[model samples]
Target: KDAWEIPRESLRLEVKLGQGCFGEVWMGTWNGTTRVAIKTLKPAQVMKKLRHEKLVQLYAVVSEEPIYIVTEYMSKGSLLDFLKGETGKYLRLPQLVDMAAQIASGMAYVERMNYVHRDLRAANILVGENLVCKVADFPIKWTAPEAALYGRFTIKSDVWSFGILLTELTTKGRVPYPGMVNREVLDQVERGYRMPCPPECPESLHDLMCQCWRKEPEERPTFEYLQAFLEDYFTSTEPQYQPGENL
Candidate 1:
């Protein structure tokens, strides 16, 4: 834990950025030089060691109680908000393709990250310049069915959240089981109430979304497989739907 320590004076806390289920997230400056997003506490976490363009960059961290983790600022904010706003409110089919492809790329690295990532959702993803989407927000409240019931977290569990992530985009930021609270969502999901396909979503992609919701965790595809599937789907010659063409 000592290894994770950083002099508190190095940071200059700014605005209260709101909180997450697991911890508080605040906006601050690191060493007075770089803007960063700070999350308070997790057993242990870091950056500089692992780097992926599709993943938010973690610059440094502090361990021990009242712990804090710092990541480079993602100005576009969470993907969920981005979807509801001007940038994503009216995504063209090709834009959706690029967003999905980039997220798949990020989640591929997530599969290789050291932690279980208990939570993964659209609100957790972040957007960068040029509409590049990257996975962010560690841990989960919207978790895999098994993990929610038994405290079990695994790579496949992460896969389930990834499925929900895609669901948000397809529906343009509509939360899964809209109007239903968490308990309701949990029970419904356990009893086989998977989401219906978005009218504009590709059939194959929706099929994959359903596949990831398998009752048995073992039935879900790994990130490696899912990313490949995205690549295939995006590259297929179905023809792009221009703004006015029956879209």
Candidate 2:
């Protein structure tokens, strides 16, 4: 048993944060100390070994029938909520760009390890204090055309979803292809209709998003490239801030 394997009794459940097909998420405490988010998943083998700064830290797991997953407590909740929620009003374009770069940094590591985040979306990304964004967790609108239509999922497909995520970030978490139902979105995508540039979104970012949405998965850029591009873009746009302040 590794340190991440926790005794089921150690977790004291508190308030429900969210509910899903597999499990419910809750705010809880581990061993009467250290607040954590417990996701009672209905299942994982890969998660225990995967670790990165931009990924949610999986602290412990109750390896039993009713499994409980313990992880760091992100006060800001999902990126979707943070963007659309009250706090989003104060966020500048550069800040949102910075969040995108952070996500790219995490996903780049995932890609480097030959892994694909089949469920990379704004709802899956959680934000913590100081506006730090961590990659977290699903599909449909955020899924690639190949993945949603067929069963194919690759790093390239992830790039497709990343395009959708960019839309979410730019639009402050607006649902992709708004005004269209899932079926319609699928149909439109199959016919080669991509979402229009979000209002006020930077042209450079929109161009990057288009590159991500290329019809041929092979034409899409890697997460590593995305990380470098975004980081460079953020720095170029916010030169004045470089003076100081670990803010």
Candidate 3:
């Protein structure tokens, strides 16, 4: 690893903050001064375009040796860890609703861009400043039943994963299916099994989650639909969350 070079002409690598199993994640600057996270990218990420507010924007990509993708540095890190790290504390309903809206709105953009995330779990979501959540991770192992069975990847399949994320956030970061392996989860899903709604989860939101977990992919609503529904759902409760205040 040429951990010494400027990764690219536009990126200035700063401190070697940490290393992952794949490569290093450096606290760096993009086009000089805009702080970012620069990490090595696998083969799949080198072929696409990605830029959105709720996504960890891929500022640049180096495809040669020591491939890297520069992205926004989410201070609070993974959404799963962020909530779990909260110990026994839980988010208020409005707070939970806000996070849900941010994620759905992002996926709505992903849908518009003609990309299927395939993997959309709490652990894959990044928690930025002000309690904001953005979808991250390019190598997707978590898959919808169609993908795991027929090798299909489509926007609808991604919708199924969003249902799982609903379980995650509502349960304060509980892993989907707990100890079950991916294949096992697939089996259960094929068997028409769905995780029960987390205690105290709004019935309406839980109904949306169930809609997303339908056996037929097309039966699931579009992320565009999800965004509109979640936004209105959040607002219908009277009063709105203040910016920078998940308080």
The lDDT of each candidate is 0.75, 0.85, 0.74
Model 3 clash number: 0
Q: Model 3 off-target regions past 4 Å?
A: 1-19, 30-32, 41-48, 87-90, 139-142, 234-247
> Which parts of model 2 are misplaced by more than 4 Å?
1-3, 234-247
Candidate 2 on 72-180: residue-level lDDT in tens?
8999899998999887877766787789999999999889888888999998899999999998762588888889888899999988888889888877778889899
> What's the true lDDT of residue 99 in model 2?
95
Count: clashes, candidate 1: 3
Residue range 31-147, candidate 3, lDDT tens digits: 776988888644455214667788887666675766777777888878878888854154766666678788999899888878777778887788887888898874222457777
Alpha carbon RMSD to native, model 1: 3.5
Judged by whole-model lDDT over C-alpha atoms, candidate 2 comes out at: 0.85
Task: Name the 10 consecutive residues with the lowest summed lDDT in model 1.
Answer: 238-247
Candidate 1, residues 3-33, lDDT tens digits: the string is: 5468777877798776667677889998787
Task: Between candidates 1 and 2, name the one with more favorable lDDT.
Answer: 2
